[PDB]
Design a protein around this ligand. Structure first.
Ligand SMILES: C[C@@H](NC(=O)c1cc(-c2ccccc2)nn1C)c1ccc(C(=O)NS(C)(=O)=O)cc1
Ligand SMILES: C[C@@H](NC(=O)c1cc(-c2ccccc2)nn1C)c1ccc(C(=O)NS(C)(=O)=O)cc1
Lengths: 301, 302
């Protein structure tokens, strides 16, 4: 409402937009509990990235605190329970990470078709394995996009330039909206048998937990390739492993895991699995857009 | 032309089209010099991939041989001098590989921007090194395309969808024609300092041998990423290694080498290098199209 503390490595645009909105702001970085508490004493708002841990002790000591803003998608460094007990609103910036998440997804799709990460490891091992890494063309193949928000939409328009047929489903996004970006919506039951590739771009909710499971993998065309650059849990990990074992799934690209880092290494260790350590939001550009978005949100209220 | 030997593993569509054209087809693979020569005794045509070596001794022993077709790009496995000397026509199928080559190139670009082969290796080694990785967003970045034939054009239209600024140069393709597919042509010297990424799609010629060398690498902006899915030697390997070691080049993706497989391991072993064993044409679709294209050429000859 009046004063905000930026307590992490943020792009200068964040301070600029807050001040333009009529808010006073203090910019500091890597503070200790007491240092953080002292600065927060006359602040209604708090802006963090990944370094600052917003624990119960910090929350309870900041009596004027009303909003905790995280410049990014995930809110693991913030005690959600302590904030909710105190009536503090916890905000994130999902839009800022959209482009980098969509780009990584497209890169993963290209990696599943041509096994570039596996071919690199092979080359680095002094091997020259041509027959093994015989791949597939993307042109003319069907891409099923489950979740048609900003990320799903950006993935669709990029893969359409490769001549992929983009189909999908989203219960929030209308068929008219998805048709404007060339995505034909079909009932979920009808999507599984048509896809050569399937990508998920939904939030993690009870309705989206295990969207790809033993039953849906069995409805897929044999040799389907799957991408999960959204959130760990949307693809049932045990069902994905069984599908890769039988060959029902020809390959998977995972940027997210139900447990991070995953203690069960069976998926990561599978030869047909490509993975990243949650790098979807890991670009200087996404970080700047999240810094900008959080300042825009704070001004709006 | 009456009998054709297919001496490498080809798509069944090749044999099927040749037979539709009235030709007798024999399909064999992994034949030795002696075995290949014996099969060709009653053959007017020979279809190869890259494993069959059409040497001077093979050409000279195959007295009925009229045509040698390669289901793919180039003819490095065919003795072009011996074929020209004995009046033997040599055919290939470069158009059959274009989409697959352009798709691999785009995959290489995305792999360099987000260090995907490195992240996979780190994960497979049982590590969670998120803090050690920082990628680059392609949107608004400049991609320089040297050579604007079929492959260069296909790379451009796909990377345009990522919001990349596509500039380039080709002495044969007019700036008006490249503008129609969104590639802004500028004098070669103006291209180097503008690119975040450079990809080569030219034939290997005296003018293109070492197109990227110590002189042109110095002209590039610090941290440039380079892709070579065209021909080994267009990017000077020695100059690329020095640029990688200095940081002038932030990363390189190589499908092709001056020597295949490469005995010099300096580039392949570099942490910022991603590579493939010449996989540009390695798709079920590209192999099927090349087999189809060479069969149509043989049937057109009869
Ligand atoms: C547009 C909206 N769609 C949905 O919410 C949605 C989609 C599905 C669904 C279920 C089954 C099959 C296919 C789709 N179910 N639901 C509840 C959406 C919202 C946020 C993100 C997002 O990416 N969030 S983020 C940046 O925080 O990860 C993405 C999309
Ligand atoms: C369009 C044409 N361009 C040229 O020939 C050309 C380009 C350059 C050049 C030199 C310096 C800097 C930038 C470009 N110089 N020249 C003579 C071309 C023809 C075939 C391929 C091909 O790839 N063929 S293939 C599938 O059989 O390998 C590719 C392109």
């Amino acid at each position: 409402l009046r004063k905000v503390l930026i307590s992490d490595s943020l792009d200068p645009c964040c301070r600029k937009i807050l001040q333009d909105g009529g808010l006073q702001v203090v910019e500091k970085q890597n503070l200790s509990k007491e240092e953080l508490i002292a600065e927060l004493q006359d602040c209604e708002g708090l802006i963090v990235r990944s370094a600052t841990k917003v624990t119960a002790d910090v929350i309870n000591a900041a009596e004027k605190l009303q909003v905790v803003g995280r410049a990014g998608t995930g809110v693991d460094n913030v005690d959600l329970e302590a904030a909710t007990r105190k009536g503090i609103l916890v905000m994130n910036t999902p839009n800022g990470n959209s482009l980098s998440a969509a780009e990584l997804t497209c890169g993963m799709i290209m990696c599943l078709a041509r096994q570039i990460p596996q071919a690199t490891a092979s080359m680095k091992d002094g091997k020259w394995e041509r027959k093994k890494f015989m791949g597939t063309e993307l042109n003319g193949k069907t891409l099923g996009i489950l979740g048609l928000g900003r990320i799903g939409r950006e993935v669709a328009t990029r893969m359409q330039s490769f001549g992929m047929k983009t189909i999908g489903y989203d219960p929030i996004i209308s068929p008219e909206v998805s048709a404007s970006f060339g995505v034909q919506q079909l009932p979920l039951e009808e999507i599984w048998p048509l896809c050569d590739f399937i990508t998920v771009h939904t939030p993690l909710l009870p309705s989206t937990t295990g969207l790809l499971n033993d039953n849906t993998f069995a409805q897929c065309k044999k040799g389907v390739r799957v991408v999960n650059c959204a959130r760990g849990g949307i693809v049932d990990e045990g069902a994905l492993l069984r599908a890769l074992q039988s060959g029902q799934c020809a390959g998977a690209a995972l940027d997210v895991f139900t447990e991070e880092p995953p203690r069960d290494r069976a998926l990561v260790d599978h030869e047909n699995v490509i993975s990243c350590p949650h790098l979807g939001a890991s670009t200087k550009e996404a970080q700047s857009r999240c810094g900008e978005e959080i300042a825009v949100q704070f001004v709006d209220m």
